[PDB]
Each structure stands twice: as C-alpha cells, then as structure tokens.
Design a protein around this ligand. Structure first.
Ligand SMILES: CN1CCC[C@@H](OC(=O)c2ccco2)C1
Length: 460
C-alpha cells in the first residue's frame, strides 16, 4: 500500500438561500456546468478529500451529511468517511475523505469566528477545519462575509478578523496565523464581493452574461480589484473565472437574474456578481494545480448557484529514519548568510527571529539583529552571518528538500511578531549558497521582507 505523493481535493461552496437542496446535486461534485469543468472520463474517479462549505444552510448536520454521502456513493460507489463537520449559525463546513485515508488523517481541528460588533454580530463569519494528511498540513475556511455592494471594506475587515482569530493547525506555531500554518490553505465561501458597476447598467450586465462576455464585468469584480490593490487575500491565488456570476438568480430557473431593489433586499440592488469563490495559498514550491473552477447549471433551489473547484495537491509521507523523529540527524544542517529583514514599522526597537518547522525538534530563537536605515527611510534589521545553524531531525534529502521554515521577526521588548513569512527548502542545489526571499506579513498585511542566502546540507 504505497503512500500518495499527490491527492485531489474537491472544494464546494454553496449559499443554499435557506432552502432544502434538490434531490440530485451530483453535478456539483462532478465539476459540471459552466467555467473550467472536469472531463467526463474522470466521473467515477473519487477525489481524495471533499470539503463542502454552505451558507444560509437550512439543514441539520445529520440531514446534510446523509445527502452528501448518498451523492458521493452514487457517483463513486465509495462510502466516504466524515473527517469533520462544523456549523456556526447557518455557515457549515463538511470534510469527507475516502475510507483508505482514515489512518493518514490526524490532528483534526475545527473552529469558527463571528465577525462584526453588536448590530453586525449575529449571522456572518467563518468556520474552518484543519488536519494532517501524512506529512502535509491542510486548512479549510468557509466564510460568509458581509453582504451589499457598498460594503467591500467590511468584507476586507471580516477577512482580517477571520485569519487572525480562527484557531486551526498547530498551536505551537504561536506567532503564525492560518495564512502560514498549512502546506495548503483553501479559503472559500460566499465572500459577497460584487460587480461594482452603476445600477442603471443592470440590463447591460445581463446582456454581457448572456453573451458569455465576462471581461468587462470581471474588471469591476470587487474581490479581484481589492486583491490587486492588496486590500484583502494577499498572497492567495484564484483560478481565472470563466463561468457566469453565481448570484442573484430567481429560484427554480437559471434563466433570470433578480437584481432590482426590493423591501426584502433592504432597497439594495444585487447586480449579478461572483459572490461565491474559492481561493488558496500553498507554501512556496509545493505542487498545487487547479483542475476545475466553475458553477453548476442544474441546481436552482437557491438564489446562488453552487461553485466547485478541484485541486491536485502535493503531499508528503510521515517520514521515519533510525535517527529522527526523537533525535537530530547530525548529517543535516541549514545555514543562513547575508540575511536582512526590511520592516515597514515606524517603531525603533530591537528584533530577533524565530525559525519554526516540523523538521526541527522545536522552534529556534536567533540573537538580536542590528538595526540600520534603508535609503528610503526604512528599518533594516541586519542578521548578516549571525543566524543559528538549524539542525533538522532528518537529513535525508527526500524529506528535507520538501520542508519549509516559517520565520517570525519579533520585538525583543514585547515578543510580538512584526512579520511572518515562509522559506521553501526545495532548493536548486545543496551545499551551495542560494538566494532566499519571503515577504513578511502580520494579520495578513504586508509588514516587510526577509532576504538572504541559504546553504542546505543533506545526507547526500
Ligand atoms: C482592510 N485593510 C486592508 C489593507 C490593510 C489594512 O489597512 C488598514 O488598516 C488601513 C488603515 C488606514 C488605511 O488602511 C486593512
């Protein structure tokens, strides 16, 4: 029974519009309909993991699990195992996996974040699941963000609150939020970003959709434009959108968008929009390939159409040698040369680095760097040659070149992280000085950069 080095992951997001689903939802899990769809020749091939995010979900967990399991069994003839299910209000995440993966999956976490204060705390937020799959950490977030075309800033704030406060993954990675804790992080949901065009243009927009001419609509998609201006989802990826806007439809057909202001909308227009989205962020130089991203055409109980995305995702095996785990492999070492952190902070305080990685017995604290001034006023923390030599638990290059080092730059005075980043050890060469780089973020906001050289020694 060989351990996989690749799995496929299905991500689904559906705002169910508080209505039970139709009797057949198989098209969703088959990635059929509009956009980048899955080849018919793959229909009987199960994905390894199915992650289902719903919003405005009127079903009990039991009712929805029974529908999902019966759907996958009908498609695949496989009885999928429940990894995790978590519900906040009407926001739900279900993770199903093939039974052969039961003993590959461990460290299952669930959490939720409620967004907003008083007025705004009551129905929006996120649920999430993480686990290990052999040597690979996987995180999944289903968020239902603030509605309304005029509230893109609120959505960006909701995103900020969710990535700060969602407690998934390894709690020993204390300086790191969910945007750094996982080999692969998938964030999906009713993100509620809208096509930001004048109200009077609604019929023009509908025309554009009927012509499958999305270019002029996507150029006004608030998620794409906010991402381009680095207001949200910094360092996340999204597949190109080639399907019609998934909101807001008249129920029981897909032929009609319902966009006009009504008492029930709070006298707001709902111009056709790509509310329903899947984004991801993987550690550098890990295999992740989007193999589908689209919407179904035949599921019409909601004012949203379901969205699907599928991924190839690189995974690693749970490595055991004669040495690690439980002792350093003295054959291996990670060295750092000419290392500098450039920070955006206006503060003048001493900094040190922490190195965190599952290839180390425990995190490593550096000595303090020496602060200098960049040309354009900036704080530059010099580490030069002073960073420690890291001693990985296993020196085998088949393990070590697949690993990553998380870096936090911490204030000596407060121990608060000013910036988090990640370095891949998937180098072009070993025993060779090679450039390294990571941006540094805090609360998912760009706070600086870390650059230098690495020199990696493996058993080879
Ligand atoms: C929501 N945003 C997105 C950009 C980064 C961060 O921006 C601010 O906090 C801010 C204050 C004044 C102007 O920007 C949070």
């Amino acid at each position: 029974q060989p351990e996989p080095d690749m799995i496929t992951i299905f991500i689904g997001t559906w705002n169910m519009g508080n209505a039970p689903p139709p009797k057949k939802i198989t098209s969703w899990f088959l990635s059929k309909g509009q956009g980048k769809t899955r080849d018919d020749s793959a229909d009987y091939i199960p994905h390894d993991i199915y992650v289902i995010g719903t919003q405005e979900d009127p079903l009990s967990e039991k009712e929805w699990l029974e529908i999902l399991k019966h759907s996958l069994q009908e498609i695949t003839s496989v009885t999928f195992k429940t990894v995790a299910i978590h519900t906040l209000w009407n926001i739900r995440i279900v993770v199903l996996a093939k039974p052969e993966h039961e003993n590959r999956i461990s460290h299952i976490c669930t959490d939720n974040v409620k967004t907003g204060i008083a007025n705004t705390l009551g129905n929006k937020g996120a649920v999430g699941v993480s686990f290990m799959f052999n040597g690979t950490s996987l995180g999944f977030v289903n968020s239902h963000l603030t509605s309304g075309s005029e509230k893109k800033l609120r959505r960006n704030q909701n995103y900020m609150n969710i990535l700060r406060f969602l407690a998934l993954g390894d709690k020993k990675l204390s300086p790191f939020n969910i945007t750094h804790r996982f080999t692969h992080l998938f964030w999906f949901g009713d993100l509620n970003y809208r096509v930001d065009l004048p109200t009077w243009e609604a019929e023009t927009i509908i025309q554009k959709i009927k012509q499958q001419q999305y270019a002029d609509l996507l150029s006004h998609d608030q998620l794409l434009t906010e991402r381009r201006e680095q207001k949200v989802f910094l360092h996340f990826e999204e597949e190109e959108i080639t399907f019609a806007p998934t909101y807001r439809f008249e129920r029981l057909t897909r032929d009609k968008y319902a966009y006009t202001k009504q008492k029930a909308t709070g006298m707001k227009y709902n111009l056709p929009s790509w509310c329903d989205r899947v984004l991801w962020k993987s550690y550098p130089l890990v295999h992740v390939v989007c193999q589908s991203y689209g919407s179904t055409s035949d599921i019409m109980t909601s004012d949203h159409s379901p969205v699907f995305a599928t991924f190839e995702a690189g995974v690693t095996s749970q490595f055991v040698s004669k040495n690690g785990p439980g002792t350093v492999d003295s054959q291996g070492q990670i060295e750092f040369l000419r290392c500098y952190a450039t920070l955006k902070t206006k503060s003048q305080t001493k900094f040190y680095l922490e190195f965190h990685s599952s290839c180390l017995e425990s995190f490593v604290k550096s000595q303090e760097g020496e602060n200098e001034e960049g040309s354009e006023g900036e704080l530059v923390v010099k580490f030069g040659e002073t960073l420690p030599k890291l001693k990985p638990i296993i020196s085998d290059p088949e393990y070590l070149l697949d690993q990553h080092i998380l870096i936090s730059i911490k204030s000596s005075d407060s121990d608060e992280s000013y910036g988090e980043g990640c370095i891949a050890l998937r180098l072009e060469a070993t025993e060779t000085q090679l450039p390294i780089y990571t941006p540094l973020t805090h609360h998912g906001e760009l706070t600086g950069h870390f650059q230098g050289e690495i020199k990696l020694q493996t058993s080879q």
